[PDB]
Design an enzyme around this catalytic site. Structure first.
Site, mmCIF file in Angstrom:
data_model
loop_
_atom_site.group_PDB
_atom_site.id
_atom_site.type_symbol
_atom_site.label_atom_id
_atom_site.label_comp_id
_atom_site.label_asym_id
_atom_site.label_seq_id
_atom_site.Cartn_x
_atom_site.Cartn_y
_atom_site.Cartn_z
ATOM 1 N N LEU A 230 0.835 -1.188 0.000
ATOM 2 C CA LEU A 230 0.000 0.000 0.000
ATOM 3 C C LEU A 230 0.878 1.250 0.000
ATOM 4 O O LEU A 230 1.958 1.252 0.593
ATOM 5 C CB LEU A 230 -0.893 -0.037 1.243
ATOM 6 C CG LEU A 230 -1.851 -1.226 1.340
ATOM 7 C CD1 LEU A 230 -2.658 -1.166 2.633
ATOM 8 C CD2 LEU A 230 -2.784 -1.294 0.138
ATOM 9 N N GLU A 231 0.403 2.304 -0.674
ATOM 10 C CA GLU A 231 0.980 3.637 -0.566
ATOM 11 C C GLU A 231 0.560 4.233 0.772
ATOM 12 O O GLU A 231 -0.380 3.748 1.393
ATOM 13 C CB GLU A 231 0.510 4.544 -1.706
ATOM 14 C CG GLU A 231 -1.002 4.752 -1.703
ATOM 15 C CD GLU A 231 -1.563 5.520 -2.886
ATOM 16 O OE1 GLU A 231 -0.945 6.567 -3.219
ATOM 17 O OE2 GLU A 231 -2.639 5.091 -3.440
ATOM 18 N N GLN A 232 1.252 5.298 1.177
ATOM 19 C CA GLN A 232 1.096 5.899 2.490
ATOM 20 C C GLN A 232 -0.378 6.145 2.816
ATOM 21 O O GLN A 232 -0.821 5.824 3.910
ATOM 22 C CB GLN A 232 1.869 7.219 2.566
ATOM 23 C CG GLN A 232 1.481 8.064 3.778
ATOM 24 C CD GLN A 232 2.337 9.292 3.981
ATOM 25 O OE1 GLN A 232 3.332 9.504 3.292
ATOM 26 N NE2 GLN A 232 1.950 10.108 4.949
ATOM 27 N N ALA B 104 -3.078 4.825 1.628
ATOM 28 C CA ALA B 104 -3.963 3.667 1.689
ATOM 29 C C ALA B 104 -3.810 2.878 2.990
ATOM 30 O O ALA B 104 -4.642 2.010 3.270
ATOM 31 C CB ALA B 104 -3.757 2.763 0.500
#
Ligand SMILES: [Ca+2]
Ligand code: NA
Length: 323
Positions: free
Chosen positions: A130-132, A134
């Site tokens: 996940l990106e930050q 998410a």
């Protein structure tokens, strides 16, 4: 197909589902066929499973980018070749601008789509990346773990180990950090964690006798690797515990692949890994963003010439198996 699982040491490499990404120093990463990926990458992560179009709704999926000029059937057979070589191919859930914002209840559908994709393309597992934004978005911390429990259970019926891996940025691995729910909920389910030890500038840790050790300090690279890993595998210095036989050290292939965290001198890693081995806690392997960057060009179009896997592949594959 069947699940091809990994019982030994790993070299993990991410695979771009797009062409000609631009680098942090002006370089280029091309798209490449799976068949071209260096065999010493025995886990390859298809990047990325995500939301392509909101008209299709909230549940992410995978669509092979047509610009790569690989048919869906050819792609499937290349996967089958990697499996006949005993290498794994995972689907990486997330990335930048993936628009993953799931609600409680969504885990049924998400489990179902993961299974479908897995049966269609013959993937062997899934990497949470996940990106930050998410990480703590809507019910992601509940839904994603819950879906993957169901996927893991599904494949247990027929005696398969559907792999589960994670790539958290390392500052989220403090005690009670944002990634702790993913780890705790999936303890007993996950095969190994490959955190990102890159792109976090001057984050790091303090060590009595040495001082402040930052992730972007080349002069102290040996100590960074050793102390951060020692902290994770022992659960000390306020880091959440990841057993050593389940920790994989994530790194950039070169200076184009990330802004900070590239290892200028491979000996720093070799040494750190031996301190860890000699105290009775060898790591499980390394990881890289990415194979495409390892096979790419700098800003004057000179080839990176597979430097990362040259530096680390034999080192890692010639280590003794984990317990
Ligand atoms: Ca460092
Ligand atoms: Na497979």
């Amino acid at each position: 197909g069947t699940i091809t699982s990994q019982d030994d040491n790993v070299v993990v490499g991410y695979w771009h589902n797009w062409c000609d990404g631009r680098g942090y120093q002006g370089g280029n990463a091309p798209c490449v066929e799976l068949k071209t990926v260096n065999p010493q990458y025995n886990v390859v992560n298809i990047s990325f499973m995500k939301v392509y179009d909101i008209a299709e709704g909230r549940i992410p999926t995978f669509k092979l980018d047509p610009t790569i000029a690989l048919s869906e059937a050819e792609f499937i057979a290349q996967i089958d070749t990697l499996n006949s070589q005993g290498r794994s191919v995972l689907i990486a859930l997330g990335g930048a601008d993936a628009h993953i914002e799931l609600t409680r209840g969504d885990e049924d559908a998400l489990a179902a789509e993961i299974i479908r994709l897995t049966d269609l393309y013959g993937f062997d597992g899934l990497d949470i990346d996940l990106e930050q934004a998410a990480i703590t978005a809507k019910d992601n911390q509940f839904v994603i773990p819950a879906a993957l429990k169901m996927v893991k259970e599904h494949y247990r019926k027929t005696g398969d180990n559907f792999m589960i891996t994670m790539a958290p940025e390392f500052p989220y691995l403090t005690a009670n950090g944002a990634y702790t729910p993913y780890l705790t909920e999936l303890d007993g389910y996950y095969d190994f964690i490959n955190p990102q030890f890159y792109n976090q500038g001057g984050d790091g840790l303090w060590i009595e006798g040495v001082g402040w050790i930052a992730q972007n300090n080349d002069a102290l690279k040996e100590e960074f690797i050793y102390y951060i890993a020692d902290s994770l595998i022992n659960g000390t210095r306020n880091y959440h515990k990841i057993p050593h036989d389940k920790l994989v050290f994530g790194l950039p292939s070169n200076i184009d692949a990330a802004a900070t965290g590239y290892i200028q001198d491979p000996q720093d890693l070799y040494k750190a890994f031996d301190r860890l081995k000699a105290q009775g806690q060898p790591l499980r392997g390394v990881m890289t963003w990415s194979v495409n960057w390892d096979m790419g060009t700098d800003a004057a179009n000179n080839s990176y010439n597979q430097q990362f896997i040259k530096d680390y592949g034999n080192f890692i594959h010639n280590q003794l198996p984990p317990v």
